[PDB]
Amino acid sequence: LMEKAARAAKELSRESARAAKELADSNAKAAEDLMREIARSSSSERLLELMAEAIRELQKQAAESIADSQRLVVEAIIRLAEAVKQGASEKEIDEIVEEAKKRLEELAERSRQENKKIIDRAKYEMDEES
Amino acid sequence: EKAARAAKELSRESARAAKELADSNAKAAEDLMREIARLLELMAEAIRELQKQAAESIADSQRLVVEAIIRLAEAVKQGASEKEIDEIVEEAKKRLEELAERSRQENKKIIDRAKYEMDE
């Protein structure tokens, strides 16, 4: 079962990573948009300050997301190594894995929501100035 | 607007580096959990260390990216035109590649250390 647990660990880590990558892509596109708002507008340092603030907020929230899902993954890994030595069933391992996998997608959903709110606020505030 | 696409590409470059680190770490978790079949403490420590170094690398990358974006955003509206913009972009790419390389090496070292000591 330890082999199976290993596969499970790699998969959880990769799911976390993929969440991080999708979030990062969204943030990239956001950066592009904000810069286009810079170009299509009057010359104002203010818009630059706002863009920088937005990008920094997005980075901070991204780091918090990664931290959360990483904590989850390492805990699931330890929990798996524990289980494959306390009483390795099969469906108990499958269950630990499926539960962690549940929490990962829930965490990632909440993350995408926070991100989205940040972006919307940013875009809007950049609209209102200039 | 060229600078906008540039911003996106730099950001995506950073993200790709991060993704490579994460994949390496997944593989590392698998191997380390194979060496278990205590050792649990070694594995936990190694994984947490890999995560910490990942976060350090991502932080450095992010600062590079945002600095480059602010520089671009000022360059446009200050003028300077295509060659100067391209130069800002390519220099940012260069420094990003350097950072990504040293980060990649440090990560590789951590993983190899970890495996080697779960062997001992």
B118 touches chain A (CB under 8 A): no
- Experimental determination approach used: X-ray
Q: How many CA atoms lie within 13 A of A83 on its CB side?
A: 24
Determine how many CB atoms are found less than 10 A away from the CB of residue B40: 15
Mutate to test the interface with B, among A38, A40, A115 (most CBs of B within 10 A): A38
Long-range contacts of B44-51, Cβ-Cβ distance < 8 Å, separation of 24 or more: B44/A74, B44/A78, B46/B110, B46/B111, B46/B113, B46/B114, B46/B118, B47/A74, B47/A77, B48/A74, B49/B110, B49/B114, B50/B25, B50/B107, B50/B110, B50/B111, B50/B114, B51/A70, B51/A74, B51/B25
- Verify whether the Cβ–Cβ distance B19 to A14 is below 8 Å: no
The phi and psi torsions of A41 (rounded to 5 degrees) equal -130, 175
Angle between helices B81-119 and B2-34 (to 10 degrees): 0
- Verify whether the Cβ–Cβ distance B26 to A13 is below 8 Å: yes
Structure tokens at B5: 């696409």
3-state SS track over A49-116: HHHHHHHHHHHHHHHHHHHHHHHHHHHHHHHHHHHHHHCCCCHHHHHHHHHHHHHHHHHHHHHHHHHH
For A42, the closest chain B residue by CA position comes to B77
Residues with Cβ < 8 Å from A123, sequence gap 6 or more?
A30, A33, A34, A37
- Choose among B15, B44, B66: nearest Cβ to A55: B66
Determine how many CB atoms are found less than 10 A away from the CB of residue A44: 14
Minimal CA separation from A68 to chain B, in Å = 11
Give residue for tokens 């800002």: B88
Euclidean distance between CA atoms A104 and B79, whole angstroms: 46
Chain B residues in contact with A25 (beta carbon < 8 A): 12, 15
- Choose among A9, A10, A32: nearest Cβ to B4: A32
Number of CB pairs, chain A paired with chain B, less than 8 A apart: 125
CB A88 within 8 A of CB A1: yes
Give residue for tokens 């995560």: B51
> Cα dist. B45→A16, A53, A114, B97, B113 in Å?
19, 35, 30, 28, 12
- Verify whether the Cβ–Cβ distance A9 to B19 is below 8 Å: no
Which value in Å is the resolution of this experimental model? 2.6
For A11, the closest chain B residue by CA position comes to B26
- Choose among B5, B29, B62: nearest Cβ to A77: B29
Structure tokens at B32: 């380390």
Euclidean distance between CA atoms B34 and B27, whole angstroms: 11
Give residue for tokens 């993350």: A111
